[PDB]
Amino acid sequence: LRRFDEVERMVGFLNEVVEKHLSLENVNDMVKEITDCESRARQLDESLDSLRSKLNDLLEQRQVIFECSKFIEVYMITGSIRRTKVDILNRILWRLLRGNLIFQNFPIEVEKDCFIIFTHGETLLKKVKRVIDSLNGKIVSLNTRSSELVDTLNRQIDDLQRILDTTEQTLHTELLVIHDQLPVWSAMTKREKYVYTTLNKFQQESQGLIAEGWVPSTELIHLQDSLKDYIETLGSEYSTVFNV
């Protein structure tokens, strides 16, 4: 029963991935293709969201160059930050450097934001970075050009977007054989766990289960005619005992 709890969790994961975009051997070989497909779907989804994050880490780095070459065309620190922490970073840097700064922000278009500091001086430059890197700000130091890193970064944006377009095509190829098959894999487990939950309710006394429970009196002869015909038609000469 812990097995078909785990497989129920795996069928739930397959139901979440699609929304996000029987004999004992016949169950034992289909739980194998549940597990063997859950493994590849989980690793391909975890190699896709962690790659989308790496894509956004470059699309946020292109924008803080586009919005800070423009500020110069109209001892400085340039980087990315979440938008809900811009005011608290402004206040912490204003309380650290008493004045002594020219702080801007330009919204990158989770939502994020850029910032320029102009730390006028020294001896706090490694201490501003302990404010930025504490609340998860990613500084983008360039030191060469605002037109040479953009080429080497657009040579990675498209090169990684093509890996997105490969792995997501493989994902939508895999989901075609699963979306038309989940009502079988789910409905197997929903009744198999229901079988074993009921088999936990039996006695297991002398290498044989004792099932005590209620049945209406109209359906007594139906049990005594359906249980008697079924144990004899399959062979296996060890008859059941039906007492009242």
Partner: protein, 392 residues
């Protein structure tokens, strides 16, 4: 005002660039302005200018500011503790130590003769060791005051205890004020003495019953050796075996035995204990007042040096040039603090920059809110030019 009481001279320390101009009175010099213009012409402006020391680097300049802010607090914590003690004892004015003379010169005048004072501090020492040095002196002086005050409380405890033995109430009172050989036995093989603390009502009952109360009790031993106001103290002479039987029988009657037994060395050692407690406290008290005034004058000089250094250093950091900065300390008359703070803000704030400029003017001394109180430390608001408000 009426949100704060002042009755002693208040100070604001400013430092400004020597090229500055007030825009609250254009066509004035800053120095001329302080005297004539500022709070109805009633401002007393005092000299507070100090020269250049030796600065490590620009890089070093940053490290120095941070420390200065911290040491300034710490010295401030100490000087407050010394004043709180002198005030607490009420053997020295509680109405001074805000405008109590330092080096027997009135406090606004003391600041006027303050140009960077020498006690151990010279202009040819490095700035990092002056920040350190000063703080070490302040911490030593305060730790001394704390120890002697600590000792003075342990001495008060001992004097109360000892006194209680000398005449108090019978629940710990041990006898040595009665030393008679007619009320106690000593050099005795069969006899001992048990003291019984008896309620005043019950005195008659005790007098009747004691001889028969335990067996083998010296008769006509009842004498009132001592009396308090709630209890009466009796001496009884009896057999050593029979002492147990008396203490127990007495408790049933509602008498309270006080276990004491006559020996010379105990009596002498109780009188000495009382004597040493008195002597210790009295020495400690005189030492405590003498020490606290001497420590106070030295810490005052130390504290103002950090404020002078700091304001200069912070100016050097924020403004750069000119290399010598125009520092003045303004002694404000009581209740004109609110007006002072505003006029300087209006006039000089523009030099610091428009971004720097915030309005949260006003002052709340009650704990109803914590807004409206300037300090560069907080992100809530900032001073808009190098200004510290000093409240003694």
């Amino acid at each position: 005002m009426a949100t704060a009481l002042y009755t002693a001279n208040d100070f604001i320390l400013i430092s400004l660039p020597q090229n500055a101009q007030p825009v609250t009175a254009p066509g004035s010099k800053t120095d001329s302005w302080f005297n004539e213009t500022l709070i109805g012409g009633r401002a007393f402006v005092s000299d507070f200018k100090i020269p250049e020391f030796k600065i490590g680097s620009l890089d070093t300049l940053i490290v120095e500011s941070e420390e200065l802010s911290k040491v300034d607090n710490q010295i401030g914590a100490s000087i407050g503790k010394i004043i709180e003690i002198l005030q607490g004892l009420n053997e020295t004015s509680t109405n001074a130590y805000r405008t109590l003379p330092i080096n027997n010169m009135p406090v606004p005048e003391y600041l006027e003769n303050f140009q960077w004072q020498t006690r151990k501090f010279k202009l040819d020492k490095s700035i990092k060791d002056l920040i350190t040095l000063i703080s070490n002196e302040s911490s030593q002086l305060d730790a001394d005051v704390r120890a002697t005050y600590a000792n003075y409380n342990s001495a008060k405890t001992n004097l109360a205890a000892a006194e209680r033995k000398k005449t108090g109430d019978l629940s710990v009172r041990s006898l040595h004020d009665i030393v008679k050989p007619e009320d106690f036995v000593l050099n005795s093989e069969h006899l001992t003495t048990v003291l019984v603390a008896v309620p005043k009502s019950l005195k008659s009952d005790f007098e009747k019953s004691y001889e028969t109360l335990s067996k083998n009790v010296v008769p006509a031993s009842a004498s009132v050796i001592a009396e308090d106001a709630e209890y009466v103290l009796f001496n009884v002479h009896l057999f050593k075996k029979n002492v147990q039987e008396f203490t127990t029988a007495a408790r049933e009657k509602k008498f309270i035995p006080r276990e004491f037994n006559y020996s010379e060395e105990l009596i002498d050692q109780l009188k000495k204990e009382h004597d040493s407690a008195a002597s210790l406290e009295q020495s400690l008290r005189v030492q405590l007042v003498r020490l606290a005034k001497t420590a106070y004058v030295d810490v005052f000089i130390n504290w103002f040096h950090i404020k002078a250094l700091r304001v200069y250093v912070e100016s050097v950091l924020r403004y750069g040039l000119p290399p010598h900065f125009n520092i003045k300390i303004i002694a404000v008359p009581p209740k004109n603090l609110s007006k002072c703070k505003s006029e300087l803000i209006d006039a000089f704030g523009f030099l610091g920059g428009n971004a720097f400029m915030k309005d949260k003017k006003g002052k709340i001394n009650k704990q109803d809110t914590s807004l409206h109180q300037y300090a560069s430390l907080v992100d809530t608001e900032y001073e808009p030019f190098v200004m510290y408000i000093i409240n003694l």
